[PDB]
Design a protein around this nucleic acid. Sequence first.
DNA 1: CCCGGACCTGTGACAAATTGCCCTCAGACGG
DNA 2: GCCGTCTGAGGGCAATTTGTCACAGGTCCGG
Length: 210
Amino acid sequence: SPRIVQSNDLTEAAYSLSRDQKRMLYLFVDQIRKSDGICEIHVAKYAEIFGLTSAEASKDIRQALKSFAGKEVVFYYESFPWFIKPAHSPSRGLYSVHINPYLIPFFIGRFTQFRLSETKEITNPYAMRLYESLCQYRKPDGSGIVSLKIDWIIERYQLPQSYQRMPDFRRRFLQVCVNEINSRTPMRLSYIEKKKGRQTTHIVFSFRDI
DNA sequence: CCCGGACCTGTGACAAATTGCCCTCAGACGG
DNA sequence: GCCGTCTGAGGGCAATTTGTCACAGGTCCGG
Ligand SMILES: [Mg+2]
Ligand SMILES: [Mg+2]
Ligand SMILES: [Mg+2]
Ligand SMILES: [Mg+2]
């Protein structure tokens, strides 16, 4: 199945994208890498890849696409827009898109890689971003260990402000996303909290392959 | 000493957003 | 050439999940 590879600069960039937008983003990165920035998406191809109907596929592409306008990317800093022209459909069931050509070197570079089947069942976009960043530290054999700082998680993934209250961080982001990964990917994930005084400062993740 | 106050935790409520579903009807094609 | 079928572009839904905040209940500080 398709092998995603991506620069670590993208794995650790600051942005806010939905699940549907990240799914499309994987195919753009795949298309670009297999080579001006103009990519293409076929409704019927998207539907088969993610086990959707043609109807529900069309709805996902259309709304994702019009929601890209105004979206930006920050590499730690420098900010860029994803698109430099609105999307448009030349043919029925087919969409044409214009990626910011200045993003090309950030896609292809110290790199991260995973098969697309590993992620196509994750629903929460924050849970996707976590699985990508763990992959960045994965070994050939399938294990790894990493400590991520809570302030850095909040900035890079752009979690909403009420998750600055730690019990909400635990309840609505950490537990759910560890649970999706353990239920929806071939990984098996555990964690422990590092504290300093009263504040929790980092989360230490350990994982292996099933 | 115990207070009021500034921290921290977890849970119950509700509001706002997203999920996979359902139905309608015109476009493109082929036989 | 007309029509039957597969597409996909629209319009909606209720059931779940995600985002937000009040309040109970712990500690330690300082005065
Ligand atoms: Mg959808
Ligand atoms: Mg009393
Ligand atoms: Mg009680
Ligand atoms: Mg009290």
